[PDB]
């Protein structure tokens, strides 16, 4: 998600 500092897709 957008608010996640480092999202894993």
């Amino acid at each position, epitope marked *: 998600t*957008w608010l996640n*500092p*480092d999202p894993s897709q």
Partner: antibody
Amino acid sequence: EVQLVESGGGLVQPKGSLKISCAASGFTFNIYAMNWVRQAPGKGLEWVARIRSQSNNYTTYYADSVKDRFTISRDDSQSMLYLQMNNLKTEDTAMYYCVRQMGDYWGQGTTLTVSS
Amino acid sequence: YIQMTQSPASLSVSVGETVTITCRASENIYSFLAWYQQKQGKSPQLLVYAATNLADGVPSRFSGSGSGTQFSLKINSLQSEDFGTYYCQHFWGTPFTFGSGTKLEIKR
């Protein structure tokens, strides 16, 4: 608040090298993924590189027109983001932006001029 | 790679008027799209994230909608300060690519 301050941009001879910097404060730097975005004078925005947090082994991503030539790095101890730029070409002349995560915060940018 | 095509390239809008900027994605990008407003000599400011979420300190007149492949930003009763260049960007994979931009002028 959150701030990203760019520095290092100047005039570089073509085929030359330059390291630009981004200083971060007002947030936990070491958990956020970071990236560089550029904007040639008068043109649109082009995404250039991304670097993930330490927890995700620092995996890096680049744009094809920049690969094997620009290297994105970060010093988490000093909340610093860097961009090593080697073998600079004319088309690399741009405003370089320090962007946080996916795009929520942008730095004011440093100008890079590649001219002889 | 995903190609974002934006429309229109430029608008001449009068104060109080409402107008919509559209932006289409080559592939399906679900809802992984953001909107930016940029003012000349300045860095782009985030308007809407995940297609429909208004970012902090942004007027309620900015409405983002769309999911899948077709997206559009809407400005209700455009103010004098709403001048600038509006960009879309997807965030579904590397590289994050941008729309070609929409230059927005104030009618006078």
